[PDB]
């Protein structure tokens, strides 16, 4: 039930990027998809999330307003649209699935991750 | 406090221990299916087909064996067989979880299939023994202990259902916590040890129940089993309580339900674990509320009236579910309506289940009790087998709606049958 990420790279500060996370072994319309940042030299941190039943977004305060998370059930993908990127956003982005499994036996499944670099 | 040593409470304690062991082992088998094999519909569906077909074939045989033997002998034999099968299944599960990496990577592709075959066969044996002990203990022993007091019988049935639901919602939590804080091998070892100790305790518990209730002591070579099967089905068809049993069996054809860890349509579809856990908890609490509703209704109305009212409630809630399905991703309104409809359907269905259980306990003579209840279980598992076939035939998401209609339709059909039973019994509203 692994999921992959794509769309990373190096962009100038203030640019735009679109990270695509493709899932294979589960529906994305019923699982709480999340994005995490892992910056060089520090632990991973929360970035964004999306609800399982409905469509609600839970961007973190540090990156709220300039980020968007949107799921697409037809392609079974999750897109993180980043606008006005700042130099401190250079990190590795991990796609995450929380609480996937049966009734009382569920886990968190992570992706390979994609490197995003911001330079001024 | 003589209540702690009465026959009723000892029966409650024995049933509680048996159900706890059963649910812990069911969760262990579900964990085995999920960990080794992916979230596959075919494997869980095949497991369900095997169990349902075995019970469908052997329901009359098990009922006849319960009927023709002494009560203590059949109760203890069923207990021992169930617990020994569960112990062997737990040992095998511990062994496979111990060699999970080798099985998934190093060992050939036939060893996993052999392990699955062994696990499903042992699970089928355990489920057969569980059906036998359910038949004997519940029907015979609860009817005899209750005697001629119907209020006591209704309270005992409701308490049995409440214990069953609380165990169904608590044993998965306990086993999951144990497995996570330890390892799946530790979980399976604990399950095996607990089942051994519970068998040792329940043997003495059944023996002590058999003492304080003196009324329990009064009571091709396959031609004979086939003759017993045919006689059982013919006797079932000739009982006054036949349409009620048919309605209860038809109520098993539903996909709308959250009371099963595996073989549930929501889990097979890919719903998140947290939402599934929340829905299962809500279904358990609403089922307890439904048993309370049955206990209250039986006193005010009759018993057939209680069945009719419970069927009306379940049909109204499933009508809410149908409105959800036909309501124009998917809006959260539809999902919330569907969940509320399923939960309120559970609250309205447990009362009907208790009503049919009481009808079978009351209106079946002591000579045909085991056989008739075995045939009733056979019908239930036949319609469960039809449900599994339907789930297999429509695995694609863009057919779920259709299934709902089918499921709801069958519920309606089932209740219609029960309604006819009412017209055959009372003739009054
Ligand atoms: C770790 C595994 C432990 C297993 C053993 C646990 C104890 C066994 C259960 C005893 C139940 C009992 O004593 O039931 C107590 C009562 C009896 O109700 P009544 O007969 O209608 O009362 C008489 C009628 N009145 C009230 C009008 C006078 O029922 C209940 O309220 C149901 C409680 C369900 C508890 C389930 C626990 C599951 C774990
Ligand atoms: O309404 C419902 N059931 C009626 C009912 N239940 C309980 C008491 C009375 C009554 F009338 C309903 C709702 O959802 C579902 C789920 C589908 N059912 C199959 C469950 C299952 N799990 C199995 C595991 C192994 C082998 C066979 C198995 N069969 N069943």
Author numbering:
A (entry chain B): 2 to 121
B (entry chain A): 18 to 236, 286 to 394, 449 to 549
Text from the published report:
A central regulatory mechanism of iron homeostasis in humans involves ferroportin (FPN), the sole cellular iron exporter, and the peptide hormone hepcidin, which inhibits Fe2+ transport and induces internalization and degradation of FPN. Vamifeport competes with hepcidin for FPN binding and is currently in clinical development for β-thalassemia and sickle cell disease. Here, we describe the cryo-electron microscopy structures of human FPN in complex with synthetic nanobodies and vamifeport (VIT-2763), the first clinical-stage oral FPN inhibitor.
In the obtained structures, both sybodies bind to distinct epitopes on the extracellular side. In the hsFPN/Sy3 map obtained from a sample containing vamifeport, we noticed a pronounced elongated density of appropriate size and shape of the inhibitor that is not present in a structure of the same protein complex obtained in its absence, where also the proximal α7a–α7b loop appears more mobile. In this position, it overlaps with the binding site of hepcidin, which locks the transporter in its outward-facing state. In this location, the terminal benzimidazole and fluoro-pyridine groups are embedded in hydrophobic pockets, with the N-pocket being constituted by residues on α2 and α11 and the C-pocket by residues on α7a and α10, whereas the linker containing an oxazole ring and connecting both aromatic groups is contacted by residues on α10, 11, and the α7a–7b loop. The involvement of the N-pocket and the region contacting the vamifeport linker in the binding of hepcidin underlies the competitive relationship between both ligands despite their stabilization of distinct protein conformations.
